[PDB]
């Protein structure tokens, strides 16, 4: 997250760190959202590589003992069947991870609330992106979980020529684009939390930003629109 602030330890208890095994250690690669005690929602592109993955829930600082973490292996990966790695602009950037054990819920570990199917946010709706992604284009990961205020940019504006044009689809949510605050490498797969009727829900799964940089004016961060996938999510969980 570029232009973020440090999240309070208990603000976003559904945020997870998706990590892969790297020699004798684990490396953060993406975010995700805990949606059942044994299921995580992330981006399809986060799991294109044939790696060994684990999920960390109750994580705040990637590099220090928080005293709240639970570490769990990924048992099964279900990518959206229409996902195509060489065509992120097509959409379908979403995957579900079944965890090897069911995590224990507490103030640091909670299920993410998903929007009702079909829900579209009004332009300029209040949202926060969260994650441990780069704090500058071509920078380095955050140590502590970051948040940035990223109001939505509706489809009409987002798909206009000076924004993303044809690259953005109605199956996506755009947010931000102010040139200061943005998602960035390592935030992918994580949540966009939006306040609706007094309650935060996870409306987006972080998918992409500009090849030119993270915080680029009129290139808002683009997210998979969770409310487009409710039936798919329910279908996967019910058959697995
Ligand atoms: C998931 O985290 C995202 O896909 C992140 N994407 C980027 O951060 N892309 C911008 C970028 C700029 C310069 C070099 C590499 C990537
Ligand atoms: Na930690």
Swiss-Prot record:
Would the keyword Transferase turn up in this protein's UniProt record? no
What does the UniProt entry say about where the protein is found?
A: Secreted
Q: Which cofactors?
A: Ca(2+)
A cellular-component GO term for this protein: extracellular space
Give the reactions, separated by semicolons, that this protein catalyses: Hydrolysis of proteins, including elastin. Preferential cleavage: Ala-|-Xaa
Domain (Peptidase S1): give its ranges.
Answer: 1-238
EC assignment: the record states 3.4.21.36
Expressing tissues: Pancreas. Basal layers of the epidermis, hair follicle and sebaceous gland epithelia (at protein level).
Top-level class of the enzyme under EC nomenclature: hydrolase
Record's keyword terms, sorted: Calcium, Disulfide bond, Hydrolase, Metal-binding, Protease, Secreted, Serine protease, Signal, Zymogen
Which residues are annotated as active site? 45 (charge relay system), 93 (charge relay system), 188 (charge relay system)
**Matches recorded under InterPro entries:** Peptidase_S1_Elastase_sf, Peptidase_S1_PA, Peptidase_S1_PA_chymotrypsin, Peptidase_S1A, Trypsin_dom, TRYPSIN_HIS, TRYPSIN_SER
Instruction: Quote the protein name from its UniProt record.
Output: Chymotrypsin-like elastase family member 1
Q: Which organism's genome codes for this protein?
A: Sus scrofa
């Amino acid at each position: 997250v570029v232009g973020g602030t440090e999240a309070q330890r208990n603000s976003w208890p559904s945020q997870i760190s998706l990590q892969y095994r790297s020699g004798s250690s684990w490396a953060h690669t993406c975010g995700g959202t805990l949606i059942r005690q044994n299921w995580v929602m992330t981006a399809a592109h986060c799991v294109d590589r044939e790696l060994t993955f684990r999920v960390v829930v109750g994580e705040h600082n990637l590099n220090q003992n928080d005293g709240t973490e639970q570490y769990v292996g990924v048992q099964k990966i279900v990518v959206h069947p229409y996902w195509n790695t060489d065509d992120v602009a097509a959409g379908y950037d979403i995957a579900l991870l079944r965890l090897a054990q069911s995590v224990t819920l507490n103030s640091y570990v909670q299920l993410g609330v998903l929007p009702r199917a079909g829900t579209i946010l009004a332009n300029n709706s209040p949202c926060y992106i969260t994650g441990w992604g780069l704090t500058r284009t071509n920078g380095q990961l955050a140590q502590t979980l970051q948040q940035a205020y990223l109001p939505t940019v509706d489809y009409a504006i987002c798909s206009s020529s000076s924004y993303w044009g044809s690259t953005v689809k109605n199956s996506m949510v755009c947010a931000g684009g102010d040139g200061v605050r943005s998602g960035c490498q390592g935030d992918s797969g994580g949540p966009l939390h939006c306040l609706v009727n007094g309650q935060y829900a996870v409306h987006g799964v972080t998918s992409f930003v500009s090849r030119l940089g993270c915080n680029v004016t009129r290139k808002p961060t683009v997210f998979t629109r969770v409310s487009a996938y409710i039936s798919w999510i329910n279908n996967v969980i019910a058959s697995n």
